[PDB]
From a paper:
Reaction centre light-harvesting 1 (RC–[name]) complexes are the essential components of bacterial photosynthesis. The membrane-intrinsic [name] complex absorbs light and the energy migrates to an enclosed RC where a succession of electron and proton transfers conserves the energy as a quinol, which is exported to the cytochrome bc1 complex. In some RC–[name] variants quinols can diffuse through small pores in a fully circular, 16-subunit [name] ring, while in others missing [name] subunits create a gap for quinol export.
We used cryogenic electron microscopy to obtain a 2.5 Å resolution structure of one such RC–[name], a monomeric complex from [name]. Here we used the previously characterised PufX R53L mutation to prevent the dimerisation of RC–[name], ensuring a good yield of homogenous monomeric complexes for purification and structural analysis. To obtain a homogeneous population of monomers for biochemical and structural analysis we used a mutant of Rba. sphaeroides in which the C-terminal Arg53 residue of PufX was altered to Leu. This single change has no effect on the rate of photosynthetic growth, and the structure shows that Arg53 is in a part of PufX that is not involved in extensive interactions with [name] or RC subunits, nor are there any interactions of Arg53 with functionally essential cofactors such as carotenoids, BChls or quinones. Our structure shows how PufX prevents full encirclement of the RC and it reveals a hitherto undescribed polypeptide, designated as protein-Y, which binds to the RC-L subunit and to the inside face of the [name] complex near the RC QB site. Here, protein-Y is inserted between [name] αβ subunits 13 and 14 and the RC, with its transmembrane helices lying against the inner faces of the [name]α polypeptides, while PufX interrupts the [name] ring and prevents the incorporation of more [name] αβ subunits, which would cause [name] to completely surround the RC. Thus, protein-Y is anchored in place at the N-terminus of [name] α, then by the hydrophobic α1–α2–protein-Y interface, and finally to the RC-L subunit, forming a stable channel on the RC side of protein-Y for quinones to enter and leave the RC QB site. Protein-Y prevents [name] subunits 11–14 adjacent to the RC QB site from bending inwards towards the RC and, with PufX preventing complete encirclement of the RC, this pair of polypeptides ensures unhindered quinone diffusion. As PufX crosses the first [name]β polypeptide, then [name] α, there is a PufX-αβ interface that consists of several close hydrophobic contacts, and the C-terminal part of PufX wraps round RC-L on the periplasmic side, held in place by a network of hydrogen bonds. Each of [name] subunits 1–13 binds two spheroidene molecules, but the 14th [name] subunit has no carotenoid.
Residue numbers in the entry:
A (entry chain AC), H (entry chain AB), K (entry chain AD), L (entry chain AE), M (entry chain AF): 1 to 55
B (entry chain BC): 7 to 48
C (entry chain M): 1 to 307
D (entry chain H): 1 to 246
E (entry chain X): 15 to 69
F (entry chain L): 1 to 281
G (entry chain AA): 1 to 46
I (entry chain BA), J (entry chain BB), N (entry chain BE): 6 to 48
The structure:
C-alpha cells in the first residue's frame, strides 16, 4: 500500500480528477435511478403510501 | 515517470487525495448506515 | 455571400488528355469524345476516351442482350403498341418461374423461361464487368480497392438473384425485372418475413446507408471548406501534408474529439459504403432460410415487447 | 434451419450478429490506428510529449514511394514544424488560446497559418509542372464564363487593389487555380480562385482590403509555384477573414 | 458616472434577452406559419390514424 | 494534449457569442458559448431518457421508448409521464442540434475554413424538425411525431408508411432513395479510387491524380475529377435529405390516399387512357 | 461574502451580462410554458 | 481537509466555475422534473386537487 | 490575481451596481410571486 | 508545484471565497429542504 | 513465475492500467446485472419479500 | 516441442498477447453464457431449486 | 514429401500462421455449434437426460 | 534472425516466462474442470 502514491507519476491528476468526477456522478445517478425503479425502494412512492397521499 | 511530478510531489498530492477519499467514503458510510437502519436490504 | 465553390466561375480548355499509359494496351482505347460545357460547370468537361478490351466486349454485349431481352418482353406485353408501351412502361414485368417449377429449367418462356435467359445474360454481364474493374486497375498498377468494393455490391445482387433462390429451392424467390414489380417484390418480401425492420442486419445495413450519406456529407463539405487551401488535391496532401489537411483534421478534432487523416478518411469511406451491402446480403440470406418471422425473432431477442 | 438453436435462443442469425460485432470492433480499431499516421504522438503545449497518449497504440510504419524521384515518405515518423511559431501562452494552465506576439498575417499563425511543404512544384503524371500561367500553357483558353483577364480587382474595403493579368491553370485537371493580379506598383500576386468572386465588371475579394494585397507572399520564379509558396499564399489570404481591419 | 454604469449593465443584459427573445419569437412565427397552412389544407377532413400505440 | 501541428492554430477569437468567456478547450473539444449550451441540452435529454425508462419500468436499452403525447392532446403540453417528457426531450434535442451547428460555425471561423459543414448539418436538422415539428403542427397533433426508442421509432416508420399503402409509390420518396443509393455508390468509388492510387501494387510508386482520371475514363468513359467528386458527394447527400423531407411534409397534408393510386394520372392521360391491351387496358 | 466582487476579476463582466440576459429570459420562458401547459394555471383558458 | 485549497493549483477557476455552473443547474432542473413527473410530489397537481381547481 | 483586466477597485464598484440591481430584480419578482399566490395559491 | 500559476497564498485566498459561496448556497438549500420537509415529509 | 515483472517491459503501464480499470468495472457491472436479472439473487426483491414490503 | 520459442521471432509478442487476452476472455464469457443459457447447468437456478428459494 | 519444406520459400510464414489460426478456430467453433444444434449430439442435453436433471 | 528483431536468447527467455504463465493458467483450469465434473458430470 505504502507506494500507491506513484500512480501520480504515471497518470496526470488533472485528467484523473475529471475522469473520477464523471465516473462517481454517473455511478451515483445510476444507483438512485435503480432504486427509484424498484417499488420497494422508491422513497417518493413509499412516503405516498405511508402518508396516504394517493386517494 | 511520465507526468513530470517528482516523488515528493506525488507523495504530497496522494496524501491530500486520500484525505478526500476517506472523507467522501465516511459520508457514504453514514448515508448507508442511515438508509440501512431505515430500510434494511438484507 | 462569398464564393462557395459549388460551381466553377470560369472554365478553361486545353488539348485533350489521352491519359496515362503504364501497361495499358493503347490500341484498345477509343479516341477522345466531345467536351460538355454543361458538365464543365460541375466537374470535368472532357468525355472519353474509353477502354474496350475483351472483357468489355463480353460485358457490354451480354448486358445489351439482357436489356434487349427485357425490352422485347415489354413490347410483347404492350401488344407491340407504341402508345401502350409508353403508357404501361413502369408496369411491365419479366417474372421468374412460378413456385411449382422449383429450380428446374423446364418452365415455359412466357412462364419464366425468358426470365432465366435474361438472368443468364445479366450474370455474365456483371461478373465480366467485375473482371474489367480489376484489370483496368492492374494495367495502371493501381490497388484493387475498386474491384473488392464492387464485390460487396455483387454479393447482395448474387444473394437476391442466385444464392437465396437456390437455398430456398425455387427461382420464384428471385426479383422480377420491372420498375414497379421490383418495388412490389421488395414490399412483399418484408410482409412474408414478418417485418424486415426487425432483421438486425437490415438495421445495420440502414445504419451504414445513413452513415454513407452522413460521411460523404461531412467529407464533401470538409474538402470544399478547405479547397481554398488546395484540399481536394488529396494525394499530394497525403504525400506532403499542407495546411488544408491540418485544418480539416483540427475542425473535426475540436468538434468531436477525434479526426481522420487525408488517406484514412478514404478508409472510413470505403468501409462505410461496403458494409451497406455486406450486411445487406447476410440479412437477406438469413431471411426465410433461418428466420421466417423477424418480429417474433425480435420478441425472443429482447428488442420488441412480448405479447 | 428455421428455429434451430445451438443453445437457448442462440440461432444461426444470433451467431451472425455476434460475429459482426466482433468484426466491427476489430475494423474500428484498424480504422482508428490507420488514422493515427499523422499528428501523433500527442504533445504538451510546451511541445514536450504528453503523459496521456490514448487507448490506441500507433500503427507500424508504412512507406510511400513518391513519384518522379521525390523519394520516400514513412509514416508515422518524427513530426516537426520546422518553422518559428510567433504565439505566446495566454495562461499557465493548458487548454487556453495562444495569442499572436506580432502581426499574425506576417507571422503566419492562426487562420493565417502555413505548413513547411516541399519548396518544389507539384508535378503531373508525366513530370511537368501541374500548375502553369495560361499564357505559358500551349493550347489553353477560357472556354466558358466571364473571362476575368483585364478586370479590376476590388478589395473588401471597396477600393481597387489591381487588375487581373493572367489565369494560372491546372494542366491535367484543366481548371483555373489562381488569378495573377498586377498591383499598383507593377509587381504581381497570385490570388486563389476559391477566394475571389468574379463579377461582370470587377473581381471582388472578400478576404482582403486593398492595403493587404502588397503583403501577399511572392513567388520566386514567374513561371511556376511551389507547394510551399501555395501554402504561404493560401494561408495568408484566408487569414484576412479574421485579421483584416474593419 | 454611476447612472452611466447602471445603464451599461442593463443594456448588456437587454442584448442577451433581446436575442433570446428574437430567436424564440421567430421560432413561434415559423410554427405559426405551418399551423396556418395546415388549417388551410383539407387535413381536418382527412385526419390520419395515430401511428403510435400510445394513440 | 495537442497534435504535433496543432499549437499554431489555437488562437483567440472567431466566437459568435461570449467573447473570451468560453473561448477554451476541454482536452480536444473546443467549448465556446454553444459548447456549454450543447452539453447542457445533451446531458439533460440523456438523463430524461433514462428517467423515462424508470417510469416505463424497463432497463433494456432496446425496449426504452419515450412516446409523444396522444392525439387527444393536440398541440398542447401533456403530463410528463404521458408525453410531456417527449416534449422536453424534443426541445433538448433541438437545442443540442442547433447549438452543435452554431459551435461548428465558430470553429470554422477560428480555422478560417468555409462554412460548408454546418450548412450541410442544417439539412439533417431540418429533416428531423420535419418529422417532429413541421409535419405534426401541420397535422395538428404532437402524436404524429415518432417516439424516441431504438426499435419503436421503426414501428412509427412502418405504421406511418402503411397508412398510405406501399410507401414506395411516393414519387418524392423514389427520388430520395435514388440519391441515397447513388451517394453510397459514389462514396465507395471515391474511397476505393483514392486508396488504389495511394496504395498501388507492391513496390510501385504512388499513382498521380492523372492515373485516377485515367482509370475512370478507361472504365466508364468519364471522370468527374477531384473537385467534382467532392461537390457530387455533398449534393447527392443533401438532395437525398431534401427530397426525404419533401416526401414526408406532403404526406398526410396534401396527399391522403394510397400512394399507388397517384400514378394513375399518367395511365389515364386522355391520348392513351382508352387504348386496349397492355397492363392497364 | 465581502469578497464575491472578485468574480469580475475572473470573468469579463460585459460577456457575463449578455449571457445572463440569455439565461434569465430562457428560464422565465420555460416556467411560463410549464404553467401554460398546466390546466390549473393556464391563464389563457380562464 | 486543510489542504483541499490546493485544488486551485490543479484546475484554473475559469474552467471549474463554468463546469460547476452547468452541473448545478443541470442537477437542480433534473430533480424538479423528477418531482413534477411524480404524482405524489407534483406541487402544481397537488395544489389543483387541494383547492378543487380542476373541472 | 486577475484574468479580466479590471482592477480591484473597479471590480468592487461594478459589483455594488450588479448587486443593487439584483436585489431590485428579486424584489419585483417577490411582488409578482406574492400577487400570484394571493390570486391562486400553489401551496 | 501547481499547473495553474496561482501561488499558494492565492490558492488559499480563492478557496476561502469559494467555500463561503458553497456554505451560503448549501445553507439556503438546507432551509429549502426544511420548508419542504415540513410541508410534505419524505421518508 | 518470478519473471512476470518483465511484462512492464513489453507493455506500457498507462494503457494496461486504463484497460484493466475499464475491464474490471464492466466485468463487475455485468455480474451485478446478471444477479439482478435473477429472481433468486436480486437482493432488492429478496428483501422486499422478506420484509413484506410489496403491497 | 523444444524449438517452439522461435515463434517469438515470427510474431511480435505485443500483438500476440493482446490478441490472446481478447480471445481467452471472449471464449470464457461465451462458455459461461452457454451454461447459463442451459437449464441443467445454470448454477443460479440449480441453487434456487436446491434451497427452495422461488415462491 | 521430403521437399515440402520449400513452401516456406514461397509463402510468408507470418501470413500462413495467422491464416491457419483463424481458419482452425472458426472450423472448430462451427463443428461444435453443429453438434450442439444436433439433438443426438448435444452433450449438455444428453447428460441432462442421463442424470434426470430437469423436471 | 526473424522478423521481430528478438534475438534467439530473448526469444528463449520470453518463451520460458510465457509457458510458465500458460501452465499456471491451465493448472487452475484443470482444477476448475475437476471440481465441476465431480459436482456435475457432463458425460
Ligand atoms: C465473396 C462474397 C462475400 C462478400 C465479399 C465482400 C468483400 C469486401 C472487401 C472490401 C475491402 C475494402 C478495403 C480494401 O482495402 O480493399 C482492397 C484490398 C487491398 O488491395 P490490393 O490491391 O490487394 O493491395 C494494395 C496494397 O497496396 C495494400 O493496400 P491496403 O493497405 O489498403 O490493403 C489492406 C486492407 C485490405 O484488407 C481487406 O480488404 C480485408 C477484407 C476482409 C473482409 C471480411 C468481411 C467478411 C467477414 C466479416 C463478416 C462478419 C459477419 C458474418 O486492410 C484492411 O482493410 C484491414 C481490415 C481489418 C479488419 C479486422 C477485423 C478483425 C475482426 C476479428 C477480431 C478478432 C479478435 C479476437 O484488397 C484486399 O486486400 C483483398 C480483399 C479480399 C476481400 C474478400 C474476398 C472474399 C473472401 C471470402 C472468400 C475467399 C476466402 C474463403
Ligand atoms: C430517418 C428516418 C426515420 C428513421 C428510420 C430508421 C430506420 C428504418 C432504421 C433506423 C436506424 C437507426 N436509427 Mg432511426 N430514424 C429516424 C430518426 C432517428 C434519429 C433522429 C434524432 O432523428 C436518430 C438519432 C436515430 C437513430 C438510429 C439508430 C438507433 C439506428 C442507426 C442510425 C445510423 O447509424 O445512422 C447513421 C449514423 C451513423 C452511422 C453514426 C452513428 C450513429 C449512432 C449509432 C446513433 C445512436 C443513437 C442512440 C441509440 C439514440 C439515443 C441517443 C443517446 C440518448 C445520446 N433515428 C426517423 C424517424 N432509423 C436503424 C436501426 O438499426 O434501428 C434499430 C434502422 O433500421
Ligand atoms: C416494405 C419494404 C421493407 C424493406 C425491405 C427490404 C428488402 C427486401 C431489402 C431491403 C434492403 C435495403 N433496405 Mg430495407 N425495407 C424497408 C425499409 C427501409 C428503409 C426505411 C426508411 O423505411 C430504409 C432506409 C431501408 C434501407 C435499405 C438499404 C440499407 C438496403 C439496400 C442497400 C442497397 O444499396 O441496395 C441496392 C443495391 C443493390 C441491390 C446492389 C446492386 C449491385 C448490382 C451488381 C448492380 C447491377 C446493375 C445492372 C447491371 C444495371 C446497370 C445499368 C447502368 C445503365 C450501367 N429499408 C421496409 C421494412 N429492404 C436490401 C437489403 O440488403 O436488406 C438487408 C433488401 O434486399
Ligand atoms: C458497396 C455498395 C454500393 C455499390 C458499389 C459499387 N457499384 C459499382 C462499383 C462499386 C464499388 C463498381 O466498381 C462498378 C462500376 O463500374 O462503377 C462505376 C459498380 C456498378 N454499380 C452499378 C449500378 C448500381 N449500383 C448500385 C448500388 C451500389 N453500388 C451500392 C450502393 C445500384 C442500386 C440499385 O442501388 C445500381 C443500379 C453499375 C453502374 C456498375 C456495374 C456495371 C455492370 O456490371 O454492368 C453490366 C451491364 C452492362 C455493361 C451494360 C448493360 C446494358 C446497357 C443498356 C448498355 C447497352 C449498350 C449498347 C451499346 C446500347 C444499346 C441501345 C439499344 C438497346 C437501343
Ligand atoms: C444531411 C446529410 C446527412 C447528415 C449530415 C451531417 N450530420 C452531421 C454533420 C453533417 C454534415 C455534422 O457536422 C455533425 C457531426 O458533428 O458529425 C460528426 C452531424 C451529426 N450527425 C449525427 C448523427 C446522424 N446523422 C444522420 C443523418 C445525416 N446527417 C444525413 C443523412 C443520422 C440518421 C439517423 O440518418 C444520424 C444518427 C451525429 C453523429 C452528429 C451530430 C451530433 C450532435 O448533434 O451532437 C450534440 C447532441 C448530442 C451529443 C446528443 C443529444 C441527445 C439528445 C438531447 C437526446 C436524444 C434525442 C433523440 C431524438 C433520441 C432519438 C432516439 C432514436 C432511437 C430515434
Ligand atoms: C439520480 O437521481 C437523483 C438526481 C434524484 C439523485 C442523485 C443525486 C446526486 C448524485 C447528486 C449529487 C450532487 C452533488 C455532486 C453536489 C455537489 C455540489 C457542490 C459541490 C456544490 C458547490 C457549490 C459552490 C458554490 C455555489 C460556490 C460559489 C462560490 C463563489 C460565489 C465565490 C467564488 C470566488 C470568487 C468570486 C473570487 C475568487 C477570486 C479571487 C482573486 C480570490
Ligand atoms: C449494475 O451494478 C450496480 C451498479 C447495481 C452495482 C455495482 C456497482 C459497482 C461495480 C460500483 C463500483 C464502484 C467503485 C469502483 C467506486 C470507486 C470509488 C472511488 C475510488 C472513489 C474515490 C473518491 C475520491 C475522492 C472524492 C477524492 C478527492 C480528493 C480531493 C478533494 C483532493 C485532491 C488533491 C489535492 C487538491 C492536492 C493537490 C496537491 C498539490 C501539491 C497541488
Ligand atoms: C424544471 O424545473 C423548474 C424550471 C420547474 C424549476 C427549477 C428552476 C431552477 C433550477 C431555477 C434556477 C434559477 C436560478 C439559478 C436563478 C438565478 C438568478 C440570478 C442570479 C439572477 C440575477 C439577476 C441580476 C440582475 C438582473 C441584475 C441587474 C443589475 C443591473 C442592471 C444594474 C443596474 C441598476 C438597476 C437595475 C437599478 C435601477 C433602478 C433605479 C432607481 C436607478
Ligand atoms: C461453440 O463451441 C464451444 C465454445 C462450445 C466449444 C469449442 C471451443 C473451442 C474451439 C476452444 C478453443 C480453445 C483454444 C484454442 C484455447 C487456447 C488456449 C491457449 C493457447 C492459452 C494460453 C494461455 C497462456 C497464458 C495465460 C500465458 C501467460 C503468460 C504470462 C503471464 C507471462 C508473459 C511473459 C512475459 C512477462 C515475458 C516478457 C519477456 C521479456 C524478455 C520482457
Ligand atoms: C454444383 O455442382 C457440384 C458442386 C455439386 C458438383 C461439381 C463439382 C465440380 C465442378 C468439381 C470440380 C473439381 C476440380 C476441378 C478439382 C480439382 C482439383 C485439383 C486440381 C486438386 C489439386 C491438388 C493439389 C495439391 C494438394 C498439391 C499440393 C502441393 C504441395 C503441398 C507442394 C507444393 C510445392 C512445393 C512446396 C515446392 C516448391 C518449390 C520450390 C523450388 C520453391
Ligand atoms: C425501346 O425498346 C427496346 C426494346 C429497344 C429497349 C427497351 C428496354 C427496356 C424497356 C428495358 C427495361 C428494363 C428494366 C425495367 C429492368 C429492370 C431491372 C431491375 C429493376 C432489376 C432488379 C433486380 C434484379 C436482380 C436482383 C437480379 C439478379 C440476378 C442474378 C444474380 C442472376 C443470377 C443468374 C441466374 C438466375 C441464371 C441461372 C441460369 C443459368 C442457365 C445459369
Ligand atoms: C421543438 C420542440 C417541439 C415540442 C414542443 C412542445 C411545446 C409544448 C408547449 C405547450 C404549451 C401549452 O399548451 C397548452 O397545453 C394545454 C394542456 O394540454 C392545452 O390544454 C388543453 O387540454 C386541457 C386538458 O388536457 C384542457 O383542460 C384545455 O381546455 C385544453 O385546451 C392548451 O390548450 C395549450 O395551450
Ligand atoms: Fe476525398
Amino acid at each position: 500500500m505504502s507506494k500507491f502514491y506513484k500512480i501520480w507519476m504515471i497518470f496526470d491528476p488533472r485528467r484523473v480528477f475529471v475522469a473520477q468526477g464523471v465516473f462517481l456522478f454517473l455511478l451515483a445517478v445510476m444507483i438512485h435511478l435503480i432504486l427509484l425503479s424498484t417499488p420497494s425502494y422508491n422513497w417518493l412512492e413509499i412516503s405516498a403510501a405511508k402518508y396516504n397521499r394517493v386517494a | 515517470g511520465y507526468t513530470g511530478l517528482t516523488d515528493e510531489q506525488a507523495q504530497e498530492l496522494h496524501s491530500v487525495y486520500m484525505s478526500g477519499l476517506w472523507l467522501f467514503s465516511a459520508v457514504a458510510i453514514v448515508a448507508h448506515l442511515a438508509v440501512y437502519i431505515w430500510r434494511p436490504w438484507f | 455571400a462569398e464564393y462557395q465553390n459549388i460551381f466553377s466561375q470560369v472554365q478553361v480548355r486545353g488539348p485533350a488528355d489521352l491519359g496515362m499509359t503504364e501497361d495499358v494496351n493503347l490500341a484498345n482505347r477509343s479516341g477522345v469524345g466531345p467536351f460538355s460545357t454543361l458538365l464543365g460547370w460541375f466537374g470535368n468537361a472532357q468525355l472519353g476516351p474509353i477502354y474496350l478490351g475483351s472483357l468489355g466486349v463480353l460485358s457490354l454485349f451480354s448486358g445489351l442482350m439482357w436489356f434487349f431481352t427485357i425490352g422485347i418482353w415489354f413490347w410483347y406485353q404492350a401488344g407491340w403498341n407504341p402508345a401502350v408501351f409508353l403508357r404501361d412502361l413502369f408496369f411491365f414485368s419479366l417474372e421468374p418461374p412460378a413456385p411449382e417449377y422449383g429450380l428446374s429449367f423446364a418452365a415455359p418462356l412466357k412462364e419464366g423461361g425468358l426470365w432465366l435467359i435474361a438472368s443468364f445474360f445479366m450474370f455474365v454481364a456483371v461478373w465480366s464487368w467485375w473482371g474489367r474493374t480489376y484489370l483496368r486497375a492492374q494495367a495502371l498498377g493501381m490497388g484493387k480497392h475498386t474491384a473488392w468494393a464492387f464485390l460487396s455490391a455483387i454479393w447482395l445482387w448474387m444473394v437476391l438473384g442466385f444464392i437465396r433462390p437456390i437455398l430456398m429451392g425455387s427461382w420464384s424467390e428471385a426479383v422480377p425485372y420491372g420498375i414497379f414489380s421490383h418495388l412490389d417484390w421488395t414490399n412483399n418480401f418484408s410482409l412474408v418475413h414478418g417485418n424486415l425492420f426487425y432483421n438486425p442486419f437490415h438495421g445495420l445495413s440502414i445504419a451504414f446507408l445513413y452513415g454513407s450519406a452522413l460521411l460523404f456529407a461531412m467529407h464533401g463539405a470538409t474538402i470544399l471548406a478547405v479547397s481554398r487551401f488546395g484540399g481536394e488535391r488529396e494525394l499530394e496532401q497525403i504525400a506532403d501534408r499542407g495546411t488544408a489537411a491540418e485544418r480539416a483534421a483540427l475542425f473535426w478534432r475540436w468538434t468531436m474529439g477525434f479526426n481522420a487523416t487525408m488517406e484514412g478518411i478514404h478508409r472510413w469511406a470505403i468501409w462505410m459504403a461496403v458494409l451497406v451491402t455486406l450486411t445487406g446480403g447476410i440479412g437477406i440470406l438469413l431471411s426465410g432460410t433461418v428466420v421466417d418471422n423477424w418480429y417474433v425473432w425480435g420478441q425472443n431477442h429482447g428488442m420488441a415487447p412480448l405479447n | 434451419m428455421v428455429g434451430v438453436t445451438a443453445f437457448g435462443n442462440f440461432d444461426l442469425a444470433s451467431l451472425a450478429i455476434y460475429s459482426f460485432w466482433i468484426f466491427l470492433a476489430g475494423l474500428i480499431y484498424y480504422l482508428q490506428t490507420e488514422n493515427m499516421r499523422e499528428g501523433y504522438p500527442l504533445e504538451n503545449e510546451d511541445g514536450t510529449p504528453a503523459a496521456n497518449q490514448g487507448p490506441f497504440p500507433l500503427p507500424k510504419p508504412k512507406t510511400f514511394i513518391l513519384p518522379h524521384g521525390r523519394g520516400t515518405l514513412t509514416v508515422p515518423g518524427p513530426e516537426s514544424e520546422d518553422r518559428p511559431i510567433a504565439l505566446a501562452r495566454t495562461a499557465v494552465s493548458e487548454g487556453f488560446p495562444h495569442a499572436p506576439t506580432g502581426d499574425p498575417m506576417k507571422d503566419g499563425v492562426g487562420p493565417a497559418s502555413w505548413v513547411a511543404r516541399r519548396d518544389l512544384p507539384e508535378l503531373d503524371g508525366h513530370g511537368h509542372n501541374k500548375i502553369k500561367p495560361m499564357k505559358a500553357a500551349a493550347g489553353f483558353h477560357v472556354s466558358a464564363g466571364k473571362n476575368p483577364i483585364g478586370l479590376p480587382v476590388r478589395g473588401c474595403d471597396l477600393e481597387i487593389a489591381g487588375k487581373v493579368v493572367d489565369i494560372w491553370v491546372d494542366i491535367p485537371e484543366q481548371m483555373a487555380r489562381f488569378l495573377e493580379v498586377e498591383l499598383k506598383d507593377g509587381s504581381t500576386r497570385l490570388l486563389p480562385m476559391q477566394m475571389v468572386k468574379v463579377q461582370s465588371n470587377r473581381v471582388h475579394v472578400n478576404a482582403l482590403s486593398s492595403d493587404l494585397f502588397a503583403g501577399i507572399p511572392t513567388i520566386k520564379s514567374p513561371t511556376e509555384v511551389t507547394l510551399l509558396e501555395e501554402d504561404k499564399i493560401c494561408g495568408y489570404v484566408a487569414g484576412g477573414l479574421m485579421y483584416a481591419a474593419p | 458616472p454611476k447612472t452611466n454604469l447602471r445603464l451599461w449593465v442593463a443594456f448588456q443584459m437587454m442584448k442577451g434577452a433581446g436575442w433570446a427573445g428574437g430567436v424564440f419569437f421567430g421560432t413561434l412565427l415559423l410554427i405559426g406559419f405551418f399551423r396556418v397552412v395546415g388549417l388551410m389544407l383539407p387535413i381536418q377532413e382527412n385526419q390520419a390514424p395515430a401511428p403510435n400505440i400510445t394513440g | 494534449a495537442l497534435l504535433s501541428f496543432e499549437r499554431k492554430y489555437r488562437v483567440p477569437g472567431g466566437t459568435l457569442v461570449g467573447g473570451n468567456l468560453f473561448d477554451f478547450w476541454v482536452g480536444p473539444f473546443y467549448v465556446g458559448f454553444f459548447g456549454v449550451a450543447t452539453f447542457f441540452f445533451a446531458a439533460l435529454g440523456i438523463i430524461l431518457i433514462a428517467w423515462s425508462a424508470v417510469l416505463q419500468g424497463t432497463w433494456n436499452p432496446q425496449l426504452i421508448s419515450v412516446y409523444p403525447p396522444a392525439l387527444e392532446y393536440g398541440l398542447g403540453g401533456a403530463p410528463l409521464a404521458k408525453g410531456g417528457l417527449w416534449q422536453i426531450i424534443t426541445i433538448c434535442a433541438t437545442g443540442a442540434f442547433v447549438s452543435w451547428a452554431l459551435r461548428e460555425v465558430e470553429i470554422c471561423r477560428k480555422l478560417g475554413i468555409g462554412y460548408h459543414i454546418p450548412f450541410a448539418f442544417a439539412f439533417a436538422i431540418l429533416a428531423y424538425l420535419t418529422l417532429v415539428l413541421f409535419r405534426p403542427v401541420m397535422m395538428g397533433a404532437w402524436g404524429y411525431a415518432f417516439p424516441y426508442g431504438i426499435w419503436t421509432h421503426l414501428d412509427w416508420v412502418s405504421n406511418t408508411g402503411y397508412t398510405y399503402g406501399n410507401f414506395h409509390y411516393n414519387p418524392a420518396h423514389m427520388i430520395a432513395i435514388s440519391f441515397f443509393f447513388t451517394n453510397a455508390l459514389a462514396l465507395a468509388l471515391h474511397g476505393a479510387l483514392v486508396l488504389s492510387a495511394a496504395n498501388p501494387e507492391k513496390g510501385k510508386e504512388m499513382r498521380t491524380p492523372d492515373h485516377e482520371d485515367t482509370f475512370f475514363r478507361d472504365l466508364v468513359g468519364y471522370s468527374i475529377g477531384t473537385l467534382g467528386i467532392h461537390r457530387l458527394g455533398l449534393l447527392l447527400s443533401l438532395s437525398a435529405v431534401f427530397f426525404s423531407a419533401l416526401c414526408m411534409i406532403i404526406t398526410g397534408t396534401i396527399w391522403f390516399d394510397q400512394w399507388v393510386d397517384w400514378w394513375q394520372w399518367w395511365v389515364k392521360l386522355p391520348w392513351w387512357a382508352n387504348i386496349p391491351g397492355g397492363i392497364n387496358g
